[PDB]
Amino acid sequence: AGWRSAGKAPEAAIRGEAVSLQPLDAPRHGAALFRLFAGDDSHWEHLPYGPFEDEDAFITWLALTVAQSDTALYVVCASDQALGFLGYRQMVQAHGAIEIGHVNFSPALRRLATEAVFLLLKTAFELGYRRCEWRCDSRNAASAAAARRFGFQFEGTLRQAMVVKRRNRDTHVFSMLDGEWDA
Query: Among Na ion, a copy of itself, none, what does residue 111 contact (CB within 5–8 Å per kind)?
Result: none
Q: Are 101 and 121 in contact (CB under 8 A)?
A: no
Query: Among a copy of itself, Na ion, none, what does residue 71 contact (CB within 5–8 Å per kind)?
Result: Na ion
Q: What is the nearest approach in angstroms of a copy of itself to the Cβ of residue 125?
A: 12
Among 20, 71, 123, 175, binds Na ion (CB under 5 A): 71
Query: Among Na ion, a copy of itself, none, what does residue 137 contact (CB within 5–8 Å per kind)?
Result: a copy of itself
**What does the alpha-carbon distance between residue 177 and residue 183 come to, in Å, rounded to a whole number?**
10
Q: Does 93 engage in binding with Na ion (CB under 5 A)?
A: no
Q: Are 20 and 83 in contact (CB under 8 A)?
A: no
Of the pair 59, 146, the CB lying nearest a copy of itself is at 146
**What does the alpha-carbon distance between residue 161 and residue 138 come to, in Å, rounded to a whole number?**
11
Which residues would be at the binding site for a copy of itself (CB under 8 A)?
2-3, 94-97, 130-131, 133, 137-139, 141, 144-145, 148, 153-163, 166-168, 170, 172-173, 175, 177-178
Of the pair 12, 94, the CB lying nearest a copy of itself is at 94
* CA torsion, ordered 20, 23, 28, 33, to nearest 10 deg: 60
**What does the alpha-carbon distance between residue 38 and residue 55 come to, in Å, rounded to a whole number?**
9
For residue 132, the tally of other CB atoms under 10 A from its CB is: 24
Question: What are the residues binding Na ion (CB under 5 A)?
Answer: 66, 71
